C-alpha cells in the first residue's frame, strides 16, 4: 500500500477564503506524474480526479473550484483546495485515494464548519 500521514478532521470558518483538505502520502516513490492517479470522494461520488497519464483534472459543476497543486504531487501532497462557497455547502467526510503504478491507498478527513 501507499501509506499516509493522517489527519482525522480539519475545521474552517467563513473567514477561510480557500479551504484545504490535507492528504499526505509518506512513501511516494514516483519520478513522473504519469504514474499517479488521485481521487477525492464525497458522499458516494468522485468530486475531483487527476489522471496523471492524460494530465486531466475533472470536477463536477458543484465543486467547480476544486483542485490540487500538481507541482506538489510527487512529494506525496495530494491536498484538495476549494473556495468557501463550495466548502460550506459540502461539509462532511472526504476520502483521498492515491495510486502510484500498482500501489494504492486511501484516507478519510472530516471537513467541519465551525464558528
Amino acid at each position: 500500500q501507499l501509506l499516509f500521514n493522517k489527519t482525522k478532521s480539519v475545521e474552517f470558518t467563513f473567514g477561510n477564503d480557500t479551504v484545504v483538505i490535507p492528504c499526505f502520502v509518506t512513501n511516494m516513490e514516483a519520478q513522473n506524474t504519469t504514474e499517479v492517479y488521485v481521487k477525492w470522494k464525497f458522499k458516494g461520488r468522485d468530486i475531483y480526479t487527476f489522471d496523471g497519464a492524460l494530465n486531466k483534472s475533472t470536477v463536477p459543476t458543484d465543486f467547480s473550484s476544486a483542485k490540487i497543486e500538481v507541482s506538489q504531487l510527487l512529494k506525496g501532497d495530494a491536498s484538495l483546495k476549494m473556495d468557501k462557497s463550495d466548502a460550506v455547502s459540502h461539509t462532511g467526510n472526504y476520502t483521498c485515494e492515491v495510486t502510484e503504478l500498482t500501489r494504492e491507498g486511501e484516507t478519510i478527513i472530516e471537513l467541519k464548519y465551525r464558528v
Binding site: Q1, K39, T99, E100, R103, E104, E106
Partner: protein, 113 residues
C-alpha cells in the same frame, strides 16, 4: 502487454492452517490496483486489496509497500472448509469508476482433513 500470472492452478491445505495464493504481474502499468476475489461473476467475494482494511484473515506475503514489488501473493489464515473455491488475482485501471483490465487464470483452493 501486462500479464497477470497465478503460478498455482491448485492449492491444497489442511483446515486450521494458512493458504498461500500466488500472483505476479509482468508490469506495474497501466496505473491501477491488484485485488483478489473468490469467484468471477457479480457475486464474487472481495478477498484482498491494499487499502486498510477490513480483511482480518487475509495478508500480503511480500513487501507490497514498495514501488518495485511485482508480486501480489496473499496468505489466508485459519482455513475452514468454507474457504474452498476458485480465487482470482485481478488488475484494474483507474476511472470513475475503476474498470477490470486483466485477470489471472484462477487458483482452485481445496481444504483437506
Amino acid at each position: 502487454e501486462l500479464q497477470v500470472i497465478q503460478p498455482d492452478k491448485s492449492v491444497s491445505v489442511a483446515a486450521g492452517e494458512s493458504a498461500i495464493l500466488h500472483c505476479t504481474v509482468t508490469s506495474l502499468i497501466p496505473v491501477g490496483p491488484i485485488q483478489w476475489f473468490r469467484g468471477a461473476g457479480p457475486a464474487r467475494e472481495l478477498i484482498y486489496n491494499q487499502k486498510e482494511g477490513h480483511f482480518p484473515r487475509v495478508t500480503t506475503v511480500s513487501e507490497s509497500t514498495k514501488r518495485e514489488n511485482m508480486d501480489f501473493s496473499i496468505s489466508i489464515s485459519n482455513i475452514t472448509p468454507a474457504d474452498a473455491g476458485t480465487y482470482y488475482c485481478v488488475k484494474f485501471r483507474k476511472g470513475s469508476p475503476d474498470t477490470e483490465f486483466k485477470s489471472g487464470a484462477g487458483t482452485e483452493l481445496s481444504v483437506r482433513a
